[PDB]
Structure 1
């Protein structure tokens, strides 16, 4: 029984960076693909390719590396996790890593990066840092 999907995604991701093989497999979901598009828009990802069969998944990703093969992030984690959910306003939100990384967040109008959430002055329920 999986208490949490965030752990599944972010842990297969980190474990895939530490070893550096490009591609990776996982059962899908609504939020996962939304945020995956954001990471592709970050630049932390090359590409993704959805695929479908009984019933969920597998959201297949192809990762990205420098020519000298430096891992493009250094770190990662969620914040808003079970037991202790957390939220933040539009003004209150963090600017991770003074501006480099990001802080994924959900809104009344969708899942987005943090920047669009402070510009719009709409906060919401934070999901994860990444940097």
Structure 2
């Protein structure tokens, strides 16, 4: 059965991006919503909507494409997994694409990006890479 909702969400985003879809609806959760908000703030997606219905709610992402129809999201990679969880220190925080990408992290100070983790000098569980 389902074992990694975050991986499912990332794969939904990847598949929609490949097929060049405009919107993407998935079941919601707080971690997923925070991930989507980070993506929007960083500019990888266009908009995020939350539908506060029954059954845990729905997230409705809107993907972003640049000029020439180029895809803003090149790739998403799950880093920490149920089968093996990954943590890093503040001084060991990895840079995605030499800084051109973001590493979504989960920290005592909320789920943030690797840039914010380095700035605040904190580590945590490296949820994902996005570039």
Q: Secondary structure of the equivalent of 1:60?
A: strand
In 1, are the aligned partners of 2:47 and 2:63 still within 8 Å (CA)?
A: yes
Whichever structure has more strand as a proportion of its residues is 2
- Normalised by the length of structure 1, the TM-score is 0.95
Q: Shift of the alpha carbon at 1:68? A: 1.2
How far 1:29 moved relative to its partner?
0.4
The alpha-carbon deviation at position 67 of structure 1 amounts to 2.8
Q: Secondary structure at the match of 1:72?
A: coil
4+ long deviations beyond 3 Å? none
Query: Take 1:119 and 1:54, find their aligned partners in 2: how far apart are those partners?
Result: 38
With normalisation by structure 2, the TM-score equals 0.95
Larger % of helix: which?
Answer: 2
Write out per-residue CA displacement over residues 33-84 of structure 1, whole angstroms, 9 at most, x where no aligned residue: 1111110011111111110222212101111111310111222111000121
**Are the counterparts in 1 of residues 17 and 73 from structure 2 also a CA contact under 8 Å?**
no
Residue 104 of structure 2 aligns to a residue whose secondary structure is strand
Cα offsets for 1:72-128 (capped at 9, x unmatched): 122211100012111000001111111100100011110000111111111111100
Which stretches in structure 1 are left out of the alignment for 5+ residues? none
Contact kept in structure 1, 2:102 and 2:113, CA below 8 Å: yes
Q: What's the Cα RMSD here?
A: 1.0
Q: List alignment gaps of at least 5 residues for structure 2.
A: none
